PDB file of C-alpha atoms and ligand atoms in Angstrom:
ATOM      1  CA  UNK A 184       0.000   0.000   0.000  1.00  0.00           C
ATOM      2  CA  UNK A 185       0.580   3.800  -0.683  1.00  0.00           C
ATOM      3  CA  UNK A 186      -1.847   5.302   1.481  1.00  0.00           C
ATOM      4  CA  UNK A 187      -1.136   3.153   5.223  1.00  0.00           C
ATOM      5  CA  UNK A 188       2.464   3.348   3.728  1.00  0.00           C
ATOM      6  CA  UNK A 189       1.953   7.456   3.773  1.00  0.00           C
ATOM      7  CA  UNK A 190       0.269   7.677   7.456  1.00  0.00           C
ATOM      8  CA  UNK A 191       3.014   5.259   8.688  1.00  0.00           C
ATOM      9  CA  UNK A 192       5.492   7.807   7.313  1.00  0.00           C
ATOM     10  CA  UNK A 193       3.720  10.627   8.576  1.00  0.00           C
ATOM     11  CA  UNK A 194       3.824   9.250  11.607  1.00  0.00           C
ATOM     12  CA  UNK A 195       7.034  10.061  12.051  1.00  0.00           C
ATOM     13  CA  UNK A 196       6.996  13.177  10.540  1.00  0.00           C
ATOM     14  CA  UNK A 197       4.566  14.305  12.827  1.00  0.00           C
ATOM     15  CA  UNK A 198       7.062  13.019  15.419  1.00  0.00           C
ATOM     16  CA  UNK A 199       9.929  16.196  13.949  1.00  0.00           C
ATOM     17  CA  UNK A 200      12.232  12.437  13.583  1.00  0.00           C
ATOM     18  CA  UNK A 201      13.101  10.315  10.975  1.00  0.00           C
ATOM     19  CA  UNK A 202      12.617   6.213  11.573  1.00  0.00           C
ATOM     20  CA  UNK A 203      11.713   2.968   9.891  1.00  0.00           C
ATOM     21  CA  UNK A 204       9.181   0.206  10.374  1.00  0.00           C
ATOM     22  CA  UNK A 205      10.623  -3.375   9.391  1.00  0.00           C
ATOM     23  CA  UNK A 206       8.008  -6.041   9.398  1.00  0.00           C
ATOM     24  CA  UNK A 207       8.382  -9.687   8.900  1.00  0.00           C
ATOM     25  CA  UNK A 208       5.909 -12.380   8.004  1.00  0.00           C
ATOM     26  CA  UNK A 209       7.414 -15.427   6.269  1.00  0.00           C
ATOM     27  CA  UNK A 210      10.743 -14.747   5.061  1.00  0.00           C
ATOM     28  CA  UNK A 211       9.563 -11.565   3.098  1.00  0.00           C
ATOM     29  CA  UNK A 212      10.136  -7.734   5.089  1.00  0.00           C
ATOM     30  CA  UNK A 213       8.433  -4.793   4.616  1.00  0.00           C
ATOM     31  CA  UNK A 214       9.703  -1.053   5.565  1.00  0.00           C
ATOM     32  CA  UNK A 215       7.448   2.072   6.223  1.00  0.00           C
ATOM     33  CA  UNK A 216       8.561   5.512   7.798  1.00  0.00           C
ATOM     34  CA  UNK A 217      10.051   8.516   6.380  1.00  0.00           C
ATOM     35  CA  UNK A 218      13.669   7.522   6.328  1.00  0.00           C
ATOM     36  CA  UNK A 219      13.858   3.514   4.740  1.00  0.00           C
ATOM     37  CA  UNK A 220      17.331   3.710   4.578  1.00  0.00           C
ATOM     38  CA  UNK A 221      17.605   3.120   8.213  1.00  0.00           C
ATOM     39  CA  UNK A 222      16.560  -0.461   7.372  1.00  0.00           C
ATOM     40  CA  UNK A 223      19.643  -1.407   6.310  1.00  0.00           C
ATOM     41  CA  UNK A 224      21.818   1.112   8.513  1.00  0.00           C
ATOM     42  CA  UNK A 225      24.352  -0.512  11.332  1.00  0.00           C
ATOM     43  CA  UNK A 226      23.255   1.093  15.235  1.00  0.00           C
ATOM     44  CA  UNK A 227      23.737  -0.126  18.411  1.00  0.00           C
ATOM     45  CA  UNK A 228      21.345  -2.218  19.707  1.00  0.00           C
ATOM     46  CA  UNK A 229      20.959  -0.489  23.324  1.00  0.00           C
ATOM     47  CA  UNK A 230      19.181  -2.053  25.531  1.00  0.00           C
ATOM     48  CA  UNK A 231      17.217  -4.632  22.615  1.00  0.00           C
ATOM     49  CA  UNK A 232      20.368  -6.866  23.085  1.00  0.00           C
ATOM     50  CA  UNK A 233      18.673  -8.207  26.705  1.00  0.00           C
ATOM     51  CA  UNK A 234      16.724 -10.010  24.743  1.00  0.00           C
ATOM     52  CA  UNK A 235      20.312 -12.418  23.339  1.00  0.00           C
ATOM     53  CA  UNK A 236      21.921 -11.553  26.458  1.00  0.00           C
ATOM     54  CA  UNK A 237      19.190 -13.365  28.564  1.00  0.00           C
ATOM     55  CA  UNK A 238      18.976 -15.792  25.986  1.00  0.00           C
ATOM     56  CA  UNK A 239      22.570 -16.788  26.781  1.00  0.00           C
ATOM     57  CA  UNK A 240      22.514 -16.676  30.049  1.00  0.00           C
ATOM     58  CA  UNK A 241      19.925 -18.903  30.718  1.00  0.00           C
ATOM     59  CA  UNK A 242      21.023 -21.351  27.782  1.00  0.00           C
ATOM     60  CA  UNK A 243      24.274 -21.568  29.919  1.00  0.00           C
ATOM     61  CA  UNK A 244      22.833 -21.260  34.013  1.00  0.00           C
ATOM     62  CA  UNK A 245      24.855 -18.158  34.702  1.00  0.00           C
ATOM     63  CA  UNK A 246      21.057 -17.551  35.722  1.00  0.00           C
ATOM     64  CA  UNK A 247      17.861 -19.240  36.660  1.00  0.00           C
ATOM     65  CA  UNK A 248      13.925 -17.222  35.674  1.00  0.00           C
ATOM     66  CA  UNK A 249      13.398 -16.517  39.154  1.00  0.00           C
ATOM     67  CA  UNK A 250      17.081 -15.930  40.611  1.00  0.00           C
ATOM     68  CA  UNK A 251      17.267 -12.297  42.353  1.00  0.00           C
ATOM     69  CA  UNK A 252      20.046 -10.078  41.276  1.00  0.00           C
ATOM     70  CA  UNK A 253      20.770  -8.489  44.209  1.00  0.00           C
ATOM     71  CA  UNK A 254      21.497  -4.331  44.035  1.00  0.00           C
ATOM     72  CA  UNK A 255      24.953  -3.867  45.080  1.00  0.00           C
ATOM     73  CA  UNK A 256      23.826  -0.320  47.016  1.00  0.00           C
ATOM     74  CA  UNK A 257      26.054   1.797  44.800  1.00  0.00           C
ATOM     75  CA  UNK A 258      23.979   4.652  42.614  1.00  0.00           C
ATOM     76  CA  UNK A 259      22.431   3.724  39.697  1.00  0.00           C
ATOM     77  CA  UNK A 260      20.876   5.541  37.001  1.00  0.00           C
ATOM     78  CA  UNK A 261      17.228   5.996  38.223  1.00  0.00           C
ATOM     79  CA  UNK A 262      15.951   5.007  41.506  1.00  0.00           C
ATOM     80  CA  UNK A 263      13.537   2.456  40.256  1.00  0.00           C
ATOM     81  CA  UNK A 264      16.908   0.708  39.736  1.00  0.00           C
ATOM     82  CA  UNK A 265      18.128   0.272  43.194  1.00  0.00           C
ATOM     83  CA  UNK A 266      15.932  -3.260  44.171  1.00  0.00           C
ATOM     84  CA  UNK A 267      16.260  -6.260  43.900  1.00  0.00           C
ATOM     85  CA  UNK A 268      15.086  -7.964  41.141  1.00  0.00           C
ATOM     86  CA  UNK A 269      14.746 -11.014  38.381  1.00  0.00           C
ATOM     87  CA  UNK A 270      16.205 -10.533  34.567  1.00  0.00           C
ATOM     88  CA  UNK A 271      12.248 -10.427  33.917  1.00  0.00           C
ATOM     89  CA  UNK A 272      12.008  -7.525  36.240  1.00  0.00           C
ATOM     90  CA  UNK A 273      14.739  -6.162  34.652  1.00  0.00           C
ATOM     91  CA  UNK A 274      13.972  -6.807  31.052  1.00  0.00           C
ATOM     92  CA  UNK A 275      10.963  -4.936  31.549  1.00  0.00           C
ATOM     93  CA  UNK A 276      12.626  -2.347  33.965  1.00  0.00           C
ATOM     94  CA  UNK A 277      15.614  -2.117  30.854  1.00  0.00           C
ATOM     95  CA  UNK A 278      17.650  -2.565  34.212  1.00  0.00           C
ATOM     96  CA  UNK A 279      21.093  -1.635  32.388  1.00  0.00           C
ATOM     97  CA  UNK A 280      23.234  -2.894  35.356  1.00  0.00           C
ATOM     98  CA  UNK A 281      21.005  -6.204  36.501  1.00  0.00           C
ATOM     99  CA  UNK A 282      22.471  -6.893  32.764  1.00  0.00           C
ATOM    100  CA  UNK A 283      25.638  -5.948  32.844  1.00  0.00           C
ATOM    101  CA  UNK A 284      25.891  -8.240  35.802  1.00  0.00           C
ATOM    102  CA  UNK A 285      25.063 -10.955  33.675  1.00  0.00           C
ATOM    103  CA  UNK A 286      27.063 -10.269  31.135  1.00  0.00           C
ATOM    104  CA  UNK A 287      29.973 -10.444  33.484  1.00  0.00           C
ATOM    105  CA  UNK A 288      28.813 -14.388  34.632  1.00  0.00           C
ATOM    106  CA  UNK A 289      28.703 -15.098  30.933  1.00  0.00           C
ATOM    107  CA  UNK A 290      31.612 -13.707  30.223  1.00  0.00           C
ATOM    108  CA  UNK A 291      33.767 -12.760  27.140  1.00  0.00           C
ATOM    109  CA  UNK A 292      34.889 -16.073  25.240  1.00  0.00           C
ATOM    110  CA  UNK A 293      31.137 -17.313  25.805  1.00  0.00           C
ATOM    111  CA  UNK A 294      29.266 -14.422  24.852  1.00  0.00           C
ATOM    112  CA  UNK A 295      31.603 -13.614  22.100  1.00  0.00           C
ATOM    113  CA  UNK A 296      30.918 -17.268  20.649  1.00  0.00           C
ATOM    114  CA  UNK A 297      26.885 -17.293  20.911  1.00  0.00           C
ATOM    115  CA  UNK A 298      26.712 -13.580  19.825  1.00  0.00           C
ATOM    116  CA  UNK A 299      28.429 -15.131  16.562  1.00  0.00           C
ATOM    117  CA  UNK A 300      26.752 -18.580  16.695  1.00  0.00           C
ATOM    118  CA  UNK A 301      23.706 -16.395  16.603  1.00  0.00           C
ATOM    119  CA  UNK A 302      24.606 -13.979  14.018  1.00  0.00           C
ATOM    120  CA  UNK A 303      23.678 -10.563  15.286  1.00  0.00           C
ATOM    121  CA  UNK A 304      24.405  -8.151  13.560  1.00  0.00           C
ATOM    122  CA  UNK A 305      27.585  -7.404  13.097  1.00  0.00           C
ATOM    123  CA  UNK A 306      28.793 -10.368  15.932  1.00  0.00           C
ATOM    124  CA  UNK A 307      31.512  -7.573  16.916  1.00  0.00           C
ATOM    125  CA  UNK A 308      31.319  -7.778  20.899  1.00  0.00           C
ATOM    126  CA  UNK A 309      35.136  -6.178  20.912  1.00  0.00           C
ATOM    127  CA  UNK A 310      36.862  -6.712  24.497  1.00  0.00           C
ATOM    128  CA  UNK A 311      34.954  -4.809  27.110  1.00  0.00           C
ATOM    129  CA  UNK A 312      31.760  -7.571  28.125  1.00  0.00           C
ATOM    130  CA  UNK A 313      29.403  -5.437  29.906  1.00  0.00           C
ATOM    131  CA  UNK A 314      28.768  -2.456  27.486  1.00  0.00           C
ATOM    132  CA  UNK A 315      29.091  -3.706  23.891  1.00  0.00           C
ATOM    133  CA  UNK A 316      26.082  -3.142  23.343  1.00  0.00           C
ATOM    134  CA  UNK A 317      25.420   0.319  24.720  1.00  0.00           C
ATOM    135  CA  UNK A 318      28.843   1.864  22.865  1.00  0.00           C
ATOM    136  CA  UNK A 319      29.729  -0.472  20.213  1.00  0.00           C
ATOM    137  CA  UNK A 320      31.312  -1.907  18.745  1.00  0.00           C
ATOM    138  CA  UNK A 321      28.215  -4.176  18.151  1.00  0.00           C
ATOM    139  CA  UNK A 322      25.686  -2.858  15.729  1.00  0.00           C
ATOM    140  CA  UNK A 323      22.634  -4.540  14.007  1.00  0.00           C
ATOM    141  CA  UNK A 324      20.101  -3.195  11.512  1.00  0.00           C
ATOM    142  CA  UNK A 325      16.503  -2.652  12.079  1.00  0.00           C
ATOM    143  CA  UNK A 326      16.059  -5.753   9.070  1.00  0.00           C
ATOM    144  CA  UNK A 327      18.451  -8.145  11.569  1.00  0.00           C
ATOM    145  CA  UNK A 328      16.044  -6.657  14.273  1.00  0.00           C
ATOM    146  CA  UNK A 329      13.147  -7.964  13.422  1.00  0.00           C
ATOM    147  CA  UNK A 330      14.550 -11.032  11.588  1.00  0.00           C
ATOM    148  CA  UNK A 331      15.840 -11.831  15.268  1.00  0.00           C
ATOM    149  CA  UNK A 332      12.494 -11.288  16.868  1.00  0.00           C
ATOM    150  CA  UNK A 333      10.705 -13.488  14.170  1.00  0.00           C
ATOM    151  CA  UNK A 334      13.267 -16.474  14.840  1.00  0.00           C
ATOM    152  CA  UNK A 335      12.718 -16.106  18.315  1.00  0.00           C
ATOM    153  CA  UNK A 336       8.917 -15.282  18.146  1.00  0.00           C
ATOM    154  CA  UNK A 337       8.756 -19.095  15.993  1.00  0.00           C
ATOM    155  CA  UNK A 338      11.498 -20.921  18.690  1.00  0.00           C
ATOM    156  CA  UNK A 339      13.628 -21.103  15.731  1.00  0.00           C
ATOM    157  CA  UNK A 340      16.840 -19.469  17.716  1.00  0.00           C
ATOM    158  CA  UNK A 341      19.938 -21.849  18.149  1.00  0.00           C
ATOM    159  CA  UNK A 342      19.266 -22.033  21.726  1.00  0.00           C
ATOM    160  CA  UNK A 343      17.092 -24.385  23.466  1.00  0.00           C
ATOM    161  CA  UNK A 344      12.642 -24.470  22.895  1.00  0.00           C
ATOM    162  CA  UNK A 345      12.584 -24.304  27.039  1.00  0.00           C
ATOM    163  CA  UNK A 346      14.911 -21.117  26.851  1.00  0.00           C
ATOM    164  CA  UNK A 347      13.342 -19.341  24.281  1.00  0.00           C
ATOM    165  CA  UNK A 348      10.028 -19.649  25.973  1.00  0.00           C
ATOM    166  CA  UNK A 349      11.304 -17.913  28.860  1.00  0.00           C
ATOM    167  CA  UNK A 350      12.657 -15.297  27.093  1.00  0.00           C
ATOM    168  CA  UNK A 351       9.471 -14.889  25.440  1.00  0.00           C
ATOM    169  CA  UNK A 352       7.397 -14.751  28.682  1.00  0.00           C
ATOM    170  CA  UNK A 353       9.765 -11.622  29.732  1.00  0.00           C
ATOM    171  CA  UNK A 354       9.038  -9.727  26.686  1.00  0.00           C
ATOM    172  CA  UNK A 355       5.263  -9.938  26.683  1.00  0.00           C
ATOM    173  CA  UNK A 356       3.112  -6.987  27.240  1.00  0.00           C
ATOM    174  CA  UNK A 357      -0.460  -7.676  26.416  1.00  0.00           C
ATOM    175  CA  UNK A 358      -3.271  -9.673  24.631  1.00  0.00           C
ATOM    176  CA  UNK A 359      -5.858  -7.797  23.120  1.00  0.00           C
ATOM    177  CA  UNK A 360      -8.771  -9.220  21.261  1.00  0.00           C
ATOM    178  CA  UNK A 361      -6.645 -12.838  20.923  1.00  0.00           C
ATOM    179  CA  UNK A 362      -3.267 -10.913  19.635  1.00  0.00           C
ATOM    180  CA  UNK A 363      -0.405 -11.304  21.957  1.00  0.00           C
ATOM    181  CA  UNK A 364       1.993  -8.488  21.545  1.00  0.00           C
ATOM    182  CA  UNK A 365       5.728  -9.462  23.057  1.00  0.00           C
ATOM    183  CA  UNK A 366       8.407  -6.351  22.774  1.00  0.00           C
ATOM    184  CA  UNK A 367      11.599  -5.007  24.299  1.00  0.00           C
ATOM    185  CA  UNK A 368      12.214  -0.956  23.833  1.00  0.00           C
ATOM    186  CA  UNK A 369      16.005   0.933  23.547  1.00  0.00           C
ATOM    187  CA  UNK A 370      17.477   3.739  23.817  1.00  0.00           C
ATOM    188  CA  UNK A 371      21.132   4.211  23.021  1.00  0.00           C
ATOM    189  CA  UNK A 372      21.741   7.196  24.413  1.00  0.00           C
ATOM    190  CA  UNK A 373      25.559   7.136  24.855  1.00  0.00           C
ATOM    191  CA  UNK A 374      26.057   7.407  20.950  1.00  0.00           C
ATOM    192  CA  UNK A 375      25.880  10.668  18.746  1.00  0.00           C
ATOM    193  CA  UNK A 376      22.691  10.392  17.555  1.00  0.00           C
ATOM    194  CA  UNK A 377      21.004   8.849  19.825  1.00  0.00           C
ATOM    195  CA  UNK A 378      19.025   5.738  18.718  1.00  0.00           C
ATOM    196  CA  UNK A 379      15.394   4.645  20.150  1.00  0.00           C
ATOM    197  CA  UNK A 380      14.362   1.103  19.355  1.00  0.00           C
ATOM    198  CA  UNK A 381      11.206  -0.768  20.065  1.00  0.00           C
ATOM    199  CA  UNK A 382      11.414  -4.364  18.535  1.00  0.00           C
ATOM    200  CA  UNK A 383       8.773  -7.499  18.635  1.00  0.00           C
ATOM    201  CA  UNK A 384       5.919  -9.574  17.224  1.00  0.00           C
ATOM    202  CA  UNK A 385       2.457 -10.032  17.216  1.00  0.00           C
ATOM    203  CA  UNK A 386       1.481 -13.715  17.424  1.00  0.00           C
ATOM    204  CA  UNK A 387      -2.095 -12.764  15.341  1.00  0.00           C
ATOM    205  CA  UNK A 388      -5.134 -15.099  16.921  1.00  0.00           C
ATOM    206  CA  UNK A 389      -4.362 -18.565  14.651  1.00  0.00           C
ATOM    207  CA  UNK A 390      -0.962 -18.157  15.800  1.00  0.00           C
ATOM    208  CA  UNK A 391       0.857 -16.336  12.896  1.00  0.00           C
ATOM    209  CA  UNK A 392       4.102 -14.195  13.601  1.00  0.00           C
ATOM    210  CA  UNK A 393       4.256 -10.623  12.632  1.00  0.00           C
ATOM    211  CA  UNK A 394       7.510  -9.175  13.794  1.00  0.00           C
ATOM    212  CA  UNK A 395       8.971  -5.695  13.672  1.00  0.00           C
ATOM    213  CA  UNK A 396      11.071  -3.341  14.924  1.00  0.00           C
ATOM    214  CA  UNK A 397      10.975   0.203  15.020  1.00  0.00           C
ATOM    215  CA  UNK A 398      13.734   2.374  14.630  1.00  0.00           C
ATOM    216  CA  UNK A 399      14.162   6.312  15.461  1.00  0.00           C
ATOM    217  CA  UNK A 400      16.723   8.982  16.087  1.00  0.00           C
ATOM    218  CA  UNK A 401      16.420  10.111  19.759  1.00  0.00           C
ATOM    219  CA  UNK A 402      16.289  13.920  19.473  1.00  0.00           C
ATOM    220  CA  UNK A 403      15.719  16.326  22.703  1.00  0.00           C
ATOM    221  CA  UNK A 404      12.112  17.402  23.411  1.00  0.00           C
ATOM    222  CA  UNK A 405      11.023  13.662  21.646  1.00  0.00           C
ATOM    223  CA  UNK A 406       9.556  11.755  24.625  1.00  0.00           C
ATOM    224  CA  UNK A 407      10.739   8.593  25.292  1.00  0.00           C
ATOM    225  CA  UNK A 408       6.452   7.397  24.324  1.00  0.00           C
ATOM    226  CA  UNK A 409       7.048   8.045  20.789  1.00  0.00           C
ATOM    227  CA  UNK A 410       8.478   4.304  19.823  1.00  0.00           C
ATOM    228  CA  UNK A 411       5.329   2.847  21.432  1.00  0.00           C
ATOM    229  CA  UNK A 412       3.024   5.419  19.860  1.00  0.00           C
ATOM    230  CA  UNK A 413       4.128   5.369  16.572  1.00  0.00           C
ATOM    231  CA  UNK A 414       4.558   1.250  16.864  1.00  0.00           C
ATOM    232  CA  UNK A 415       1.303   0.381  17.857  1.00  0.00           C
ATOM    233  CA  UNK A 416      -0.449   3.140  15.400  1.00  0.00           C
ATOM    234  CA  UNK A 417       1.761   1.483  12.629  1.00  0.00           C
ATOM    235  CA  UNK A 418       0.401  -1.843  13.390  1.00  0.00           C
ATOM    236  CA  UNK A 419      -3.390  -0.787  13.940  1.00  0.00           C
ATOM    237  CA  UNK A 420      -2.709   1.204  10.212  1.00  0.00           C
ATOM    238  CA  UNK A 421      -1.779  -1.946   8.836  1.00  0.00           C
ATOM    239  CA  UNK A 422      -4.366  -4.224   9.996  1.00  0.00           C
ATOM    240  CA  UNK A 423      -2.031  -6.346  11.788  1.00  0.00           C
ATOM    241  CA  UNK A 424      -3.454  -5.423  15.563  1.00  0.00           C
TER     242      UNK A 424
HETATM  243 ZN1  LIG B  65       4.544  19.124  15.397  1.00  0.00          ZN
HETATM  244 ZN1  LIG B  66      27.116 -23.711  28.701  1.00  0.00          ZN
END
C-alpha cells in the first residue's frame, strides 16, 4: 500500500524524527517511515540486546527465571533501579546494570561465541563484556532486528525451545482481542545520535508471527512514548493489531 504506507510515514513526521518500520511475516520484510534507509543502517542495539543476552545466560545457568540479582547499594541511574530484582524484572525495567551483571557471569569467550553462533548483527562484541552493546562496537540493523524477533517469536533461535520460551514470557506486554503483543524498547543514548528502538511480534489469533522493529533517532524534546506510539499506530494502520 501507498496510502497506510503514507500515514506510517507521517507518523514520524509528525514526530519532527526520521525512523523505519521493518516487518516480517514469512521470510519476506516490509519497511514504512520517512527515512527507509535506516533499514539497512548498522546502530547499536541499546538495551534490545537483553533479549540475546538473557537468551545466553539462561542457555548456559549463569542464571535461573526466578534468581534475584541483588542491588549492590552503589547509585544507579534511576531510583527504580536500586531493588532487587529477576532478569524479567529487569527486562521490563531495561535494568542496564542487573544486565551488565550478567554479562559479566557469561563472560567474554562465551558471549563472544553465541553472539556469533547467533549472528547478530555485526557479531563484533570487541573486548569490554558489559557495554558492547550500549557503545559499540556491536551494531545490528533494524532488518536483523526484526529477523531476530521473528526467529525467536517461531522458537527457531539456536538455543534451546525451554529457553526461548522464557525469554518470550519476559518480553510480553499484552493480549488484546486474541493478539499477543511481546516487545523489548532501547534507547542508546551514549552514541551521537542517539538511537530509540522498540522491537517485537504479534502472534495474530491462529498463531501467525508478525515481527517488527521500530527504529528512530532520539532527538531532545522527543519523549521517550514516541516508539510505542508510533509502533502500535503502525500496526493498527496496517491491519495487523
Ligand atoms: Zn509538530
Ligand atoms: Zn554452557
Amino acid at each position: 500500500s501507498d496510502v497506510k504506507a503514507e500515514k506510517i510515514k507521517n507518523l514520524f513526521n509528525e514526530a519532527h524524527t526520521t525512523g523505519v518500520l521493518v516487518i516480517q511475516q514469512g521470510q519476506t520484510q516490509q519497511s514504512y517511515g520517512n527515512d527507509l534507509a535506516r533499514a539497512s543502517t548498522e546502530y547499536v542495539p541499546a538495551s534490545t540486546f537483553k533479549m540475546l543476552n538473557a537468551l545466553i545466560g539462561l542457555e548456559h545457568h549463569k542464571a535461573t527465571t526466578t534468581e534475584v540479582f541483588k542491588w549492590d547499594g552503589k547509585k544507579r541511574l534511576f531510583p527504580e533501579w536500586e531493588k532487587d530484582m529477576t532478569l524479567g524484572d529487569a527486562m521490563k525495567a531495561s535494568a542496564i546494570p542487573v544486565y551488565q551483571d550478567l554479562a559479566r557471569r557469561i563472560g567474554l569467550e562465551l558471549m563472544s561465541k553465541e553472539v556469533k553462533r547467533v549472528g547478530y548483527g555485526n557479531a563484533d562484541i570487541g573486548t569490554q563484556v558489559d557495554n558492547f552493546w550500549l557503545v559499540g562496537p556491536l551494531k545490528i540493523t533494524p532488518q536483523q532486528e526484526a529477523q531476530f524477533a521473528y526467529k525467536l517469536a517461531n522458537k527457531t533461535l539456536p538455543f534451546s525451545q525451554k529457553v526461548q520460551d522464557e525469554v518470550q514470557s519476559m518480553l510480553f506486554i499484552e493480549e488484546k482481542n486474541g493478539n499477543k503483543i511481546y516487545a523489548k524498547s532501547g534507547w542508546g543514548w551514549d552514541v551521537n545520535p542517539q538511537v530509540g528502538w522498540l522491537t517485537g511480534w504479534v502472534v495474530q489469533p491462529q498463531g501467525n508471527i508478525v515481527a517488527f522493529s521500530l527504529n528512530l533517532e532520539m532527538k531532545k524534546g522527543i519523549p521517550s512514548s514516541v516508539r510505542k506510539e508510533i509502533t502500535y499506530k503502525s500496526l493498527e494502520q496496517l491491519g495487523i493489531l
